[PDB]
Design a protein around this motif. Structure first.
Motif, PDB file in Angstrom:
ATOM      1  N   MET B   1      75.720 -51.565  65.519  1.00 47.18           N
ATOM      2  CA  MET B   1      74.263 -51.584  65.541  1.00 47.18           C
ATOM      3  C   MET B   1      73.717 -50.204  65.902  1.00 47.18           C
ATOM      4  O   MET B   1      74.465 -49.338  66.357  1.00 47.18           O
ATOM      5  N   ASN B   2      72.417 -50.001  65.697  1.00 44.71           N
ATOM      6  CA  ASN B   2      71.800 -48.696  65.930  1.00 44.71           C
ATOM      7  C   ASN B   2      71.528 -48.392  67.404  1.00 44.71           C
ATOM      8  O   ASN B   2      71.519 -49.294  68.246  1.00 44.71           O
ATOM      9  N   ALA B   3      71.304 -47.113  67.700  1.00 48.43           N
ATOM     10  CA  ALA B   3      71.165 -46.633  69.074  1.00 48.43           C
ATOM     11  C   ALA B   3      70.186 -47.448  69.930  1.00 48.43           C
ATOM     12  O   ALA B   3      70.518 -47.864  71.050  1.00 48.43           O
ATOM     13  N   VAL B   4      68.983 -47.672  69.410  1.00 43.14           N
ATOM     14  CA  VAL B   4      67.963 -48.396  70.170  1.00 43.14           C
ATOM     15  C   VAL B   4      68.340 -49.855  70.427  1.00 43.14           C
ATOM     16  O   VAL B   4      68.032 -50.408  71.484  1.00 43.14           O
ATOM     17  N   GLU B   5      69.017 -50.476  69.467  1.00 41.75           N
ATOM     18  CA  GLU B   5      69.520 -51.832  69.664  1.00 41.75           C
ATOM     19  C   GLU B   5      70.569 -51.873  70.777  1.00 41.75           C
ATOM     20  O   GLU B   5      70.584 -52.793  71.597  1.00 41.75           O
ATOM     21  N   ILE B   6      71.438 -50.867  70.804  1.00 39.91           N
ATOM     22  CA  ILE B   6      72.492 -50.779  71.818  1.00 39.91           C
ATOM     23  C   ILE B   6      71.946 -50.669  73.243  1.00 39.91           C
ATOM     24  O   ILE B   6      72.322 -51.449  74.133  1.00 39.91           O
ATOM     25  N   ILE B   7      71.050 -49.710  73.462  1.00 39.43           N
ATOM     26  CA  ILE B   7      70.466 -49.525  74.785  1.00 39.43           C
ATOM     27  C   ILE B   7      69.542 -50.683  75.183  1.00 39.43           C
ATOM     28  O   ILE B   7      69.170 -50.815  76.352  1.00 39.43           O
ATOM     29  N   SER B   8      69.186 -51.532  74.223  1.00 39.71           N
ATOM     30  CA  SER B   8      68.324 -52.677  74.523  1.00 39.71           C
ATOM     31  C   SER B   8      69.109 -53.892  75.009  1.00 39.71           C
ATOM     32  O   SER B   8      68.531 -54.834  75.549  1.00 39.71           O
ATOM     33  N   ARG B   9      70.425 -53.866  74.822  1.00 37.97           N
ATOM     34  CA  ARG B   9      71.258 -54.993  75.223  1.00 37.97           C
ATOM     35  C   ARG B   9      71.146 -55.240  76.723  1.00 37.97           C
ATOM     36  O   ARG B   9      70.842 -54.330  77.494  1.00 37.97           O
ATOM     37  N   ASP B  10      71.366 -56.486  77.127  1.00 35.60           N
ATOM     38  CA  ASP B  10      71.356 -56.838  78.540  1.00 35.60           C
ATOM     39  C   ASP B  10      72.794 -56.979  79.030  1.00 35.60           C
ATOM     40  O   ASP B  10      73.478 -57.957  78.719  1.00 35.60           O
ATOM     41  N   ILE B  11      73.259 -55.981  79.774  1.00 34.39           N
ATOM     42  CA  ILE B  11      74.631 -55.999  80.263  1.00 34.39           C
ATOM     43  C   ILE B  11      74.708 -55.641  81.737  1.00 34.39           C
ATOM     44  O   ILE B  11      75.781 -55.342  82.242  1.00 34.39           O
ATOM     45  N   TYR B  12      73.567 -55.670  82.418  1.00 40.07           N
ATOM     46  CA  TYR B  12      73.536 -55.411  83.853  1.00 40.07           C
ATOM     47  C   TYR B  12      74.563 -56.279  84.587  1.00 40.07           C
ATOM     48  O   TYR B  12      75.262 -55.809  85.480  1.00 40.07           O
ATOM     49  N   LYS B  13      74.662 -57.546  84.203  1.00 37.62           N
ATOM     50  CA  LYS B  13      75.546 -58.466  84.908  1.00 37.62           C
ATOM     51  C   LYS B  13      77.007 -58.048  84.755  1.00 37.62           C
ATOM     52  O   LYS B  13      77.757 -58.068  85.724  1.00 37.62           O
ATOM     53  N   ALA B  14      77.396 -57.672  83.540  1.00 38.73           N
ATOM     54  CA  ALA B  14      78.779 -57.255  83.267  1.00 38.73           C
ATOM     55  C   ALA B  14      79.158 -55.999  84.031  1.00 38.73           C
ATOM     56  O   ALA B  14      80.263 -55.890  84.557  1.00 38.73           O
ATOM     57  N   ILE B  15      78.237 -55.050  84.086  1.00 42.85           N
ATOM     58  CA  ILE B  15      78.489 -53.802  84.791  1.00 42.85           C
ATOM     59  C   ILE B  15      78.567 -54.013  86.312  1.00 42.85           C
ATOM     60  O   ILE B  15      79.333 -53.333  87.016  1.00 42.85           O
ATOM     61  N   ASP B  16      77.811 -54.978  86.820  1.00 43.34           N
ATOM     62  CA  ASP B  16      77.879 -55.301  88.247  1.00 43.34           C
ATOM     63  C   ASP B  16      79.233 -55.915  88.606  1.00 43.34           C
ATOM     64  O   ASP B  16      79.820 -55.602  89.639  1.00 43.34           O
TER      65      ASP B  16
END
Ligand code: AMP
Ligand code: AMP
Ligand code: ASN
Ligand code: ASN
Ligand code: MG
Lengths: 285, 294
Positions: B1-16
């Motif tokens: 997927m494109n750059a803006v779609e990537i940074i829009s993902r919700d992955i806060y939980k995974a990174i925590d």
């Protein structure tokens, strides 16, 4: 040194110190609510500081010079405070083989949403001071004692010592060099660059480098063009900047091997690396 | 997927979760007297990843360094053995790997860049390493129940199956994984020259997660004898030329018996958050066969 000589060196003490340093630093950041990210080594974009390249499924990718742009992207994703133990590749010539350069090294690279330059400097001072007190318990030796370090403007450094080289040689406490004309990601306002390098004493040289960041498209594009870089080397980054999704932030990277070198007191940085990566000398192993 | 779609993902939980996992695992090893090494990304030599039933026989990405061909790290296995040869006793490294695998390995479990916590122990046997890994995993799963509020496999030790019996019974470790509800070991897998072989028995082990999540760890006891090592390289049709400096060290008699393993960090994070695809736990996805946009 051939392969057998490389592995016949004594390096146990340096590695022991390194382990204590990594344990101390990673904990310093997780204690303060930083997210611990994993690095990336291949991307269409990297720190401009010519990066080595490799084709990946038909597309040209750059080997990571540094993760500065990816740190800004992590902030744009709303991670808030992040750090990574990021391996860097920097193929400097034989001339940079001065005892403090290696063509592969790791930096503890961190970024903070909305932080100001004095906040990050104060944070690094807190880390270095705590670390030096431990290094005294670890190695029964004495290290610089200041809780805060003197701040020199880049121009005052040029004036008094001529170079950051001579500056480092003359000093006996770590010291900051600030306001250093640099790359497009460092924030410049009113002709003042909001950036900072922490320099070690006794000629050991730079150990940390950082700054507040640009987050505004037009300003960023102007500095890129102005430096004669091609905007298409940063295309996907600039598309996030254009979407107004970059956020104000500040950070720095800490050279792990350089820090280990200082604490062990090694003459050449190669002595703290199990597999030396000496500029201008392709590694045997 | 494109750059803006990537940074829009919700992955806060995974990174925590990832942060807590990295904190837990590195402390696990430092508490036990392991030395913490930094990774190398470029070297004249790297893991062949062949023979190996789990691979398709990829070639390492290459780049010139001062005119000399260097391979990007497939894995630090050979470097781990060299570290043991330098007398460091017990070592680990958070090692990034680049493995440019095909679209056929885009199964939710693979990425072309990932990190493995790679460790090695002088003199250790396969039972020792397997027990250490169970200890690490059991303790991790207990902490994960507190972090997430969900329940995880409770086994303190895991069952052990021969590779050959897995194939006959389930047809594949993939299918074995889908049918199991606790982690399990698969052992005795004919593969790379560095895993120890004795009278047709391979002294190696893969830890497999349940519920179709697949392999999360792989390791073995090692070969250390020059003649044994060179014979295995030759029989696989690999080239001695590809391991020249390592074979010099082996020829000098400087490799020591050891055992270790690598643990997939992102694969572990994926399991604990229950992500369908490993890309969901990576801020910058590296999908096999698809060049990343950032
Ligand atoms: N071991 C190292 N070898 C080369 N560069 C490094 C090393 N450690 C840190 N750096 C980076 O080197 C830059 C400083 O350049 P220099 O003035 O030549 O010391 C900063 O961007 C540091 O992050
Ligand atoms: N393509 C991949 N993506 C994510 N993790 C991987 C990948 N390949 C290997 N691993 C992890 O790294 C461990 C050791 O690598 P290996 O023995 O070479 O397959 C595996 O057991 C996995 O946990
Ligand atoms: N390449 C660098 O040293 C950049 C530095 N790590 C920063 O955060 O700005
Ligand atoms: N295949 C691999 O990645 C090697 C693995 N890390 C081991 O220790 O055996
Ligand atoms: Mg494996």
């Amino acid at each position: 040194m051939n392969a057998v000589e490389i592995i016949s060196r004594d390096i146990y003490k340096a590695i022991d110190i390194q382990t204590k340093i990594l344990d101390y630093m990673t904990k310093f950041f997780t204690d303060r609510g930083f997210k611990w990210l994993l690095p990336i080594m291949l991307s269409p974009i990297t720190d401009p500081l010519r990066p080595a390249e490799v084709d990946v499924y038909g597309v040209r990718m750059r080997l990571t010079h540094s993760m500065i742009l990816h740190k800004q992207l992590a902030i744009a994703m709303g991670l808030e405070k992040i750090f990574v133990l990021s391996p860097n590749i920097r193929l400097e010539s034989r001339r940079k083989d001065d005892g403090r350069h290696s063509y592969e090294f790791t930096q503890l690279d961190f970024e903070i949403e909305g932080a100001k330059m004095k906040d990050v400097m104060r944070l690094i001072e807190e880390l270095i001071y705590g670390l030096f007190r431990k290094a005294e318990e670890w190695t029964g030796r004495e290290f610089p004692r200041a809780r805060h370090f003197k701040v020199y403007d880049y121009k005052d450094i040029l004036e008094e010592f001529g170079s950051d080289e001579k500056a480092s040689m003359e000093m006996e406490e770590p010291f900051w060099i600030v306001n250093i004309p640099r790359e497009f990601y460092d924030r410049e306002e009113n002709g003042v660059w909001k950036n900072y390098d922490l320099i070690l004493p006794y000629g050991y040289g730079e150990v940390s480098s950082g700054g507040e960041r640009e987050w505004e498209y037009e300003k960023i594009v102007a500095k890129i063009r102005a430096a004669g870089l091609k905007e298409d080397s940063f295309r996907p980054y600039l598309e996030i900047a254009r979407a107004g999704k970059l956020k104000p932030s500040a950070g720095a990277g800490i050279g792990v091997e350089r820090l280990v070198r200082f604490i062990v007191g090694a003459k050449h940085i190669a002595e703290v690396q199990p597999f030396p990566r000496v500029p201008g000398i392709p590694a045997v192993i």
